[PDB]
C-alpha cells in the first residue's frame, strides 16, 4: 500500500541518521532509561515524513507527548530507536519500530535495522516480509531444539523473571538477551529465534512487532496467555507449539 | 608483523566464507558434538581455510583447532589456536552475531590475536605488548567506575551449574544498567576489549574460544582473570574480563551468597 511505502521510507531515513550517528547529549528519563540525540532526530525525521504524507493522523511517540489526529480512526506508534542503551555502547543491534493503529488495531507495522539493512514489514493479512521476500516463524516443535530470547529487568520483578529463566534455561538450546524489544519480535516472525517473552513494554516497543509475528503464522499473548498485551505490558510470542511450552515453563512454581 | 598478517588474512578469508553459508544455512549439514553444541559445514569450511592458509604460512607451528584432531607442531614451541566460528548456534539461526578467533601462543603465552565478525566487518586485533586495534583504530576498554552504569555481557549454561550461575545473575542484574547474552565467547570478548560492554563473566569455555579475546582485553588496558581472581583462565574454563574497576566488582557481585 501506499501507507506502507510511506512508513517504509520514513524508517529508513530515520535509520540512515541513526547509522550516520552511530559512526550525543544523553539524558536518564529514569533509572537504567537512556535518550539521546540520536533518538531524537529519528522521532523528528519519523514525525517529519508521516506527517508530509498523512497529515490527518495522530502520533503517539516514544520521546514527545501524544498527537491527537484529525481523523480520529488513525494515529502512527513510533519507537525511533528501539535498543538506546546497544546504541550508545556501540552494540550494532537496535532499530527503528513504526506501526499504524486504524480503529484501535495495528494494522501495519515496519520494524528497520540500518545496521544490517534488514527491513521487516506487515499488513495486516498481507503477511510478513524480510527485506520484500515473505518469511515465518520456524516450525520447531520441542525446546530443546530452540533458542529463546528474552527481555531482563535490571536495575521491580526481578525475582519472578529468574524463576522464568531457570524454567526456560532448562529446556532450550539457548537462551539470548540481545538489549532491543522490537527487532527482538522481528526475529522471532522471521524464524531467527524461535520465542520471546519480556515484561515492562510499552505500545512502541511492541505494536509493529506484534502484528510481524501474527502475520508470520506465529501467537502472541500476554504472559498469561490471554489478550491483554497492551495493559499488561507483557508478551510471550512464537509459533503456535513453543508459544504455549513457553507459557507453561514460565508459570512453572509461580 | 608479518604472522598477523597472515592471521588476519587467514580470519577475513574464513569470513568471507561464513558469510557466503550464511545465507543457505539450509543445505549445511549440522551435527550434534554433545547436547545443544552443534557444528556444521560452515564451521568445518571456515577451519579448512584458516589451516591452509596458516599452513602454508608456517608450516612448522601446531595447531589447536575446534573442530579437528590437534596438530603438533615440528616447532614445539608455536601454535595457532583456532575457533573456526564462534556462535555456531547463532550462525545456524540467523542472528548476526558470531566470530572467527585465531591466536597465536608462543611459549604457553598468547602473543598474537585476531576476532573478526564478517556480518558486520568488524576486525579486533592485538599483538603482545603493542595494544587493541579495531579496524585500524586503536580501541580501549570502558572508562566507566559504577556497576550502575554499566553493560554487562554474560555467558550461560543451558540444557550443570545452573543454580550457581543464577545467583550470580541476580547479583549482578540487580546492579547495572543492562545484561546482554550475545550467544558468542570470542566476540564477546572483543566487545569487552572496545569498549562496548564494560564487563563479561562466563563458564565453561574452551581454550579457542577465549585465548585470542584475553589477550584483546588486556592489551586494551583491561583485566582477565578466572571467576576466583587468579590466572588459572584454560584449566577453570571461566572468566571475568574488564576494566579495573568494574572487574573487580563484579568479581564481588558473583561471590554474594555462594
Ligand atoms: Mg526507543
Ligand atoms: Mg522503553
Ligand atoms: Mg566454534
Given at each position: 500500500?501506499?501507507?506502507?511505502?510511506?512508513?517504509?521510507?520514513?524508517?529508513?531515513?530515520?535509520?540512515?541518521?541513526?547509522?550516520?550517528?552511530?559512526?550525543?547529549?544523553?539524558?536518564?528519563?529514569?533509572?537504567?532509561?537512556?535518550?539521546?540525540?540520536?533518538?531524537?532526530?529519528?522521532?523528528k525525521i519519523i514525525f517529519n515524513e508521516l506527517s508530509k504524507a498523512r497529515p490527518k493522523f495522530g502520533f503517539l511517540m516514544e520521546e514527545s507527548e501524544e498527537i491527537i489526529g484529525e481523523?480520529?480512526?488513525?494515529?502512527?506508534?513510533?519507537?525511533?530507536?528501539?535498543?538506546?542503551?546497544?546504541?550508545?555502547?556501540?552494540?550494532?543491534?537496535?532499530?527503528?519500530?513504526?506501526?499504524?493503529?486504524?480503529?484501535?488495531?495495528?494494522?501495519?507495522?515496519?520494524?528497520?535495522?540500518?545496521?544490517?539493512?534488514?527491513?521487516?514489514?506487515?499488513?495486516?493479512?498481507?503477511?510478513?516480509?524480510?527485506?520484500?521476500?515473505?518469511?515465518?516463524?520456524?516450525?520447531?516443535?520441542?525446546?530443546?531444539?530452540?533458542?529463546?530470547?528474552?527481555?531482563?529487568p535490571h536495575l521491580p520483578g526481578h525475582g519472578t523473571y529468574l524463576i522464568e529463566l531457570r524454567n526456560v534455561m532448562a529446556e532450550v538450546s539457548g537462551i539470548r538477551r540481545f538489549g532491543t524489544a522490537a527487532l527482538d519480535l522481528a526475529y522471532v516472525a522471521a524464524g531467527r529465534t524461535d520465542g520471546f517473552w519480556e515484561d515492562n513494554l510499552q505500545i512502541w516497543d511492541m505494536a509493529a512487532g506484534i502484528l510481524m509475528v501474527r502475520e508470520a503464522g506465529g501467537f502472541v499473548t500476554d504472559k498469561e496467555g490471554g489478550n491483554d498485551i497492551f495493559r499488561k505490558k507483557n508478551i510471550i510470542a512464537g509459533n503456535e507449539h513453543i508459544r504455549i511450552k513457553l507459557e507453561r515453563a514460565l508459570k512453572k512454581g509461580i
Open positions: 500500500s501506499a501507507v506502507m511505502n510511506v512508513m517504509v521510507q520514513a524508517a529508513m531515513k530515520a535509520g540512515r541518521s541513526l547509522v550516520r550517528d552511530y559512526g550525543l547529549q544523553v539524558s536518564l528519563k529514569g533509572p537504567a532509561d537512556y535518550v539521546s540525540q540520536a533518538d531524537r532526530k529519528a522521532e481523523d480520529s480512526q488513525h494515529r502512527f506508534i513510533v519507537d525511533p530507536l528501539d535498543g538506546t542503551t546497544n546504541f550508545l555502547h556501540g552494540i550494532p543491534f537496535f532499530a527503528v519500530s513504526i506501526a499504524l493503529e486504524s480503529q484501535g488495531k495495528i494494522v501495519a507495522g515496519v520494524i528497520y535495522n540500518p545496521i544490517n539493512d534488514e527491513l521487516f514489514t506487515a499488513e495486516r493479512g498481507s503477511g510478513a516480509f524480510f527485506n520484500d521476500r515473505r518469511c515465518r516463524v520456524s516450525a520447531r516443535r520441542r525446546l530443546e531444539d530452540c533458542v529463546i530470547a528474552t527481555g531482563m
